[PDB]
């Protein structure tokens, strides 16, 4: 795919037929499944098993194989009850799964992020050893491209923190480690976090010194004391017209802070200059 | 023209690394005057400071080797006349060890000082072994002389 030339090395990578590839994949699936049910007695073989699993997930692009490995890892994390695969060593396998973000196929990335989201929404595991070693995964999720996933991650992040502006600014400045996102503009997420400490229900309006169109009240003010009667009678059509106009006028003065604030924090994620300005 | 290659070599595409200040002209001079990415100096925002830690070091050592100190007393473990002797000991030790080691290193044709020379000096002249930093037989003439002497003895 990269087009690199083939060199003369005895153990050089080669190509295999599709039939042989499928046969080998089936063999690997069977071997892994049969070996994984005796995790309690692997002993000296405990580590090579995890090493081969990590290598397979890191390199291979076979969707069924990676899917099965991920399902097994999830089962270990959640439904296991006995002594674990070396306690917090499955996290070593999970860390290697972050490589899915640059594969041009968001299936595996979406599965991994769903697993992480499930991990981080659970009351049983909160402030535990398991939620302290998934910071990289959570941040990579907050950086994601799919709108729904990113919004879910940001919603959890905002739900955890406090709601005081000074508290949020202090957390951003000296509370978080941004080492994971060092190669991308990570101030958009900081601005999104900051904007969560702003009241969003109350209505808004430009100051009284700003410029707007000509109000009707000023135009009709001269007739305040004019107690006359129009020669032409008021009809049904005029009444309907004025009722609709009054409804529109009422709708005009119903702008809240959220209407303007939310689209800004959603739009800033596709332009760095606007994020800088914000 | 110029030979713009279809692909650059590995030396040109490097992702620069921090670099020190070389040249010897000096740094921080406010006069009329560079690498791509210079290295940040060292700084400390707030803390005890070296002027306190260095002075407390000797009392720390005394506490370590004295066995322990009871509550409500510390520091004054050596009288004023013994601290001076200890400091003189330290300075003399450093100077002597370095002077021996540099000559020993230069002897064997080397042009740089390595930890091996210092370790050899410390082992063979002071009986000090620091971990974590990485035979003889007779010849034929001696055997012949011993055989002759033993034969004459009987």
């Amino acid at each position: 795919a990269s087009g690199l030339r083939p060199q003369a090395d005895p153990n050089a990578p080669t190509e295999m037929k599709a039939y042989d590839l499928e046969i080998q994949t089936n063999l690997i699936l069977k071997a892994i499944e049969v070996t994984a049910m005796r995790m309690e007695i692997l002993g000296d073989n405990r580590r090579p098993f995890l090493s081969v699993l990590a290598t397979i997930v890191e390199k291979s692009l076979h969707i069924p194989l990676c899917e099965k490995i991920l399902e097994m890892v999830e089962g270990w994390v959640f439904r296991s009850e006995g002594t674990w695969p070396t306690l917090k060593e499955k996290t070593a396998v999970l860390h290697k799964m972050i490589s899915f973000e640059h594969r041009t196929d968001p299936t595996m990335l979406h599965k991994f992020l769903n697993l992480v989201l499930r991990i981080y929404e659970d009351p049983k595991i909160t402030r535990t050893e398991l939620t302290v070693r998934m910071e990289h995964a959570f941040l990579i999720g907050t950086r994601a491209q799919d709108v729904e996933m990113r919004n879910k991650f940001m919603s959890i992040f905002d739900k955890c923190l406090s709601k005081t502006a000074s508290a949020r600014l202090a957390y951003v400045i000296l509370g978080q480690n941004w080492d994971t996102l060092a190669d991308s503009y990570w101030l958009a997420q900081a601005s999104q976090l900051l904007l969560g400490a702003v009241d969003m229900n109350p209505t808004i309006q430009l100051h009284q010194d700003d410029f707007r169109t000509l109000p009707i009240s000023q135009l009709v003010a001269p007739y305040a004391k004019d107690s006359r009667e129009p020669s032409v009678m008021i009809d049904d059509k005029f009444e309907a017209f004025m009722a609709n106009h009054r409804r529109f006028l009422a709708e005009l003065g119903d702008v809240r802070a959220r209407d303007v604030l939310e689209p800004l924090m959603q739009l800033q994620h596709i332009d760095a200059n606007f994020a800088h300005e914000l | 023209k110029l030979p713009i290659p279809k692909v650059l070599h590995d030396k040109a595409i490097q992702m620069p690394q921090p670099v020190p200040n070389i040249g010897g002209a000096g740094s921080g001079r406010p006069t009329y005057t560079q690498p791509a990415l210079p290295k940040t100096p060292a700084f400390q925002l707030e803390g005890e400071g070296e002027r306190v830690l260095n002075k407390k070091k000797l009392d720390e050592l005394v506490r370590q080797v004295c066995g322990g100190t009871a509550e409500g007393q510390d520091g004054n473990m050596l009288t004023p006349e013994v601290e001076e002797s200890v400091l003189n000991m330290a300075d003399a030790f450093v100077d002597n060890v370095l002077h021996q080691a540099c000559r020993n290193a230069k002897e064997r044709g080397s042009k740089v000082l390595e930890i091996r020379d210092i370790q050899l000096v410390l082992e063979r002249v002071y009986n000090i072994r620091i971990p974590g930093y990485a035979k003889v037989q007779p010849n034929s003439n001696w055997i012949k002389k011993m055989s002759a002497v033993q034969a004459a003895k009987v």
């Binding site: 491209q145 799919d146 709108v147 005081t164 502006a165 000074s166 400490a197 009241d199 109350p202 808004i204 309006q205 430009l206 100051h207 010194d209 700003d210 410029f211 707007r212 169109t213 000509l214 009707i216 009240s217 135009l219 009709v220 003010a221 007739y223 006359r228 129009p230 032409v232 008021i234 059509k237 005029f238 017209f241 004025m242 609709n244 106009h245 009054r246 529109f248 006028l249 005009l252 003065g253 702008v255 802070a257 209407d259 303007v260 939310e262 689209p263 800004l264 959603q266 739009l267 596709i270 332009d271 606007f274 300005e277 914000l278 | 023209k1 110029l2 713009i4 040109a12 595409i13 490097q14």
Partner: protein
């Protein structure tokens, strides 16, 4: 040339070629400067438009800029992955909110229809017993440049809303909003016409200044002119429908179509469409010609009106025929 000099990750062919050209040039690459340097400034020193916010852990409100995302929103909306509709919807929401903020909020008396019909009666006749004291108060504390910038921004927002009708999802919402705005602007224009009629009948030189400062509501005419000659079709149809809606609302409010052309709005529209023919871009000329055609053959303001405006219309159309370059397509000339 100076923009292609970037490090490794950027294509090195362009960078090295640019470096070679600059080197071969010699001493002529730092001598071409004639003027001093361009710099960007601001037309006014007053504070920009803003609205108050409220931080949770504080007791005092704080002002926030009221122009922040408009440029990016318009650029993302009117310039065309599977996530595009999301961002287009966000941009449209922001634009609608900004337009509603610019137009403003008002509270009117209870019996508005009576006063509106009284205004119509005064306009049809020439009553001289109307007090316009509030419109002779001199306003000498605010900027005029700021007013012009706000007017331009409002015009841009209206143009974006008009263009947004070519996306089937957003057609209904923006169409309803535009119709409501057109009716509101007609209601404003009737009273403005009454005030203008009264003003010209008192030729004085007293030291009472002009009226207040406000955003002109006739930016809709410029938006319509710029929208009539568009590549899409729904945009042109909406541009025509807006004029038809203005005329229908005027007819409904006045009571009968006899005295409708006594307003000052139609002279302004005619002047706008006639001046649109003198610009130096072919699409503006096409828009002006189409606007004249729509006024003539789809409204029927009357006969005295056309008799009065015939000379201007003829001059404008003849100039459109004159000034079109003789190698571009012939559509504009044929329309004229």
């Amino acid at each position: 040339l100076f923009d292609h000099l970037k490090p490794h990750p950027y294509s090195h062919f362009h960078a090295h070629t640019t470096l070679r050209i600059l080197g071969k040039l010699g001493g002529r690459n730092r001598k071409f400067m004639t003027e001093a340097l361009p710099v960007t400034f601001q037309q006014y020193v007053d504070d920009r438009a803003s609205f108050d916010l409220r931080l949770i852990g504080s007791k005092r409100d704080r002002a926030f800029p009221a122009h922040l995302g408009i440029d990016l929103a318009i650029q993302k909306l009117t310039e065309i992955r599977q996530y595009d509709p999301y961002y287009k919807r966000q941009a449209l929401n922001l634009i609608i909110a900004q337009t509603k903020l610019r137009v403003g909020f008002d509270s009117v008396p209870e019996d508005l229809p009576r006063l509106v019909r009284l205004q119509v009666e005064d306009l049809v006749k020439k009553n001289r017993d109307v007090d316009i004291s509030l419109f002779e108060v001199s306003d000498k504390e605010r900027s005029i440049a700021k007013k012009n910038e706000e007017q331009a921004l409002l015009k841009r927002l209206l143009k974006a809303l008009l263009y947004a009708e070519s996306i089937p999802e957003f057609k209904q919402e923006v169409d309803a909003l535009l119709v409501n705005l057109a009716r509101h602007f007609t209601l404003i224009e009737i009273g403005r016409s009454v005030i203008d009629m009264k003003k010209a009948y008192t030729p004085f030189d007293t030291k009472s200044g002009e009226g207040p400062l406000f955003i002109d509501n006739r930016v809709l005419s410029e938006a319509i002119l710029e929208s009539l000659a568009n590549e899409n079709l729904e945009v042109r149809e909406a541009a025509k429908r807006l004029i038809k809606e203005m005329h229908n609302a005027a007819v409904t409010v006045f009571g009968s179509p006899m005295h409708v052309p006594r307003m000052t709005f139609w002279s302004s529209l005619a002047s706008t469409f006639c001046h649109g023919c003198y610009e130096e871009e072919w699409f503006t000329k096409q828009g002006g010609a189409l606007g004249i055609q729509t006024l003539l053959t789809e409204i029927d303001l009357g006969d005295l009106w056309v008799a009065a405006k015939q000379i201007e219309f003829v001059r404008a159309l003849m100039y459109v025929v004159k000034d079109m370059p003789q190698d571009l397509p012939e559509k504009t000339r044929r329309t004229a």
